[PDB]
């Protein structure tokens, strides 16, 4: 048995590989849920900053999901539950930065404002219950109005009504929110048309 020594020295790679190789070669090795869950947190703790490669975070998600079904009896099911939530929020934060980048560049070569709305909508659909739903929704609203401004004169009223639909959808989703003031100026500009 070695993994816990590598875990105490914060060498998460060796700790992880000495734990997992032992409970892969035999379903519990001889350390059972302790090795599994130490390996899960060790794999979690190598997590990059939210805009690097992310390769270990998908692996962490699937490893914890498969832990929940190898040992559903464990008290560490909760300790994996909130961990997979934290990982999901980081994965969503990556997509949120992507959508923010497309809003920042804007109507530069290409379009990039239609890109912003579809990127953040993909975020909303791929991870339904994240914290960042408010930020994603307000980013949709801002990008909707931004596209409505610069569109061709035959095709502006439809973008305006899409913007007002997003306004009422944001109110339906969040009857109160810290971002309502800018939303309401967007509404007051678009409801005229």
């Amino acid at each position: 048995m070695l993994g816990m020594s590598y875990y105490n020295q914060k060498d998460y790679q060796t700790a992880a590989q000495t734990f997992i190789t032992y409970f892969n070669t035999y379903p519990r090795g001889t350390f059972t849920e302790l090795a599994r869950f130490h390996a899960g947190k060790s794999l979690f703790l190598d997590t990059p900053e939210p805009r690097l490669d992310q390769s270990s975070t998908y692996q962490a998600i699937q490893q914890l999901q498969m832990f929940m079904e190898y040992f559903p009896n464990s008290t560490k099911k909760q300790e994996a539950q909130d961990m997979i939530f934290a990982l999901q929020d980081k994965l969503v934060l990556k997509e949120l930065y992507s959508a923010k980048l497309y809003y920042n560049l804007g109507n530069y070569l290409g379009n990039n404002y239609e890109s912003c709305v579809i990127t953040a909508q993909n975020a909303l659909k791929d991870y339904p219950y994240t914290d960042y739903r408010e930020e994603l929704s307000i980013l949709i609203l801002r990008a909707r109005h931004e596209m409505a401004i610069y569109s061709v004169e035959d095709k502006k009223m439809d973008r305006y009504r899409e913007t007002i639909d997003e306004y009422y959808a944001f109110k339906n989703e969040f009857p109160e929110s810290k971002y309502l003031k800018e939303a309401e100026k967007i509404f007051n500009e678009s409801q005229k048309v």
């Binding site: 490669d53 290409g110 239609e114 890109s115 579809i118 993909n122």
Partner: protein, 520 residues
Amino acid sequence: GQKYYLRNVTWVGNTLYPSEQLNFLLRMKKGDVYNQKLLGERTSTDDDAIGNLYYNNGYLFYNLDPVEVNIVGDSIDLEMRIYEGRQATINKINISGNDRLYENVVRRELRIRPGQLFSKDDLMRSLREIQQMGHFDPEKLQPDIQPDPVNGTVDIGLPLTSKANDQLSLKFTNFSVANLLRPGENYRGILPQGDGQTLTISGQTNAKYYQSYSISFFDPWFGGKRPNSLSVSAFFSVQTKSIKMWGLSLGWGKRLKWPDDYFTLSAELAYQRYNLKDWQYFPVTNGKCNDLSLSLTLARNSIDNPIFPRTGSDFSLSVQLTPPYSLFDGKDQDNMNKLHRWVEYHKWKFKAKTYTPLMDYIAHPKCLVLMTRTEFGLLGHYNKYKKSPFGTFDVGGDGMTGYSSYATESIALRGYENSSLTPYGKEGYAYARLGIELRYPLMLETSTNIYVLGFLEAGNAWHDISKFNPFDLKRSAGIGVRIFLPMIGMMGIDWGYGFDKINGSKEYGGSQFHFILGQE
């Protein structure tokens, strides 16, 4: 057992392109030998085939089938059956392998966008931009295209392979000032990496003949919102009674949209001061001199690989003024350390490289290339007598040797000793250099890259600008090799034979060796 006569050809399913144009692009006619690749290779493999003519235009939901009918006697009648789907919109872009570089840095240089329609030229251009950026390996890149026929969209996976660029001197290539002044969440003992910004420091600490300090910084996306860049640098140096030189500069670059979107304009403003007493290798001997210079440079760059290019070109046209104090703006050894409190000139340059493959390429990508070099320069003067003693050209040899000094511009001319064409009292105020090079690479890999070459060169320089003559050149030929190191720049070996005499003497010609370091 098969037939052998092409009796007719036919089309069904097409709407997007005219039937006669596809007859031409299929390159067939009735009354010709019946084959199969003759059709297939021209419909499903080659770059002008009909299938590619649909695929590259974003119509990826397609299929095709050569129908054979009237299989009688010697003949077959043929009908092209194809499917036109809906033009694919990009749904997602996934990028992986970026160990040490935020996605912010790379997604801003992509030419494709989520929500726009797919096209081959945009994808190829995006891969060219990534290759030229240099933070990833220029080889072994290929996109993982995945379509979805239910929603009718496509998502592109970009698997990338990383390499770190760093070399007394230091060449931090992905160093961030924002991460320096305010760490994100944990600096964790690491340098403040990211954002694609670059920092560089260099200097000599010999101190008994040479001493120097220098620093530079470059931000390719200033403000993080547009492709316009900021560049700043500064330097200082002693050399043994001594000579003192220091200065700094600030510049600003911008991508254009007029001829094409490859052109980049650059503007820069610079300051320098020279400090001397009882010094002797310059015409100036005692005093202090200044110069303010404004430079405009127009450049276009279209190559594929920085380290061993195989297609494209690199053109530059530059002009560098300093204000004309001799005119009414400023109006009024014998007196030469006089009147050069402020130095005056206007320097012009033209510089072009050309790369072509000579054996297809793409296939057997090791390839073989022919290069081409051309550069001209003029250091003009507003007034016949107040010619600048600083900024002159120095030519002959490796070129690197001249960076023991910073008041001149050193130009390699291969096969002629070092600084041979421009000795003391014959400083160069105009030059020309030309050359063919034929190159073959031995190895191209992530860590190290190797190639061998043979060359023909001609060049010259003049102390008097009015005697510029690009058809009277000192001529050379030879062979050489170069090495790119994992944690150092180039090192290479060049041999050259100088055929023609200099100033009536053959002493500097003949066999010569040059030892290149860093990068030309």
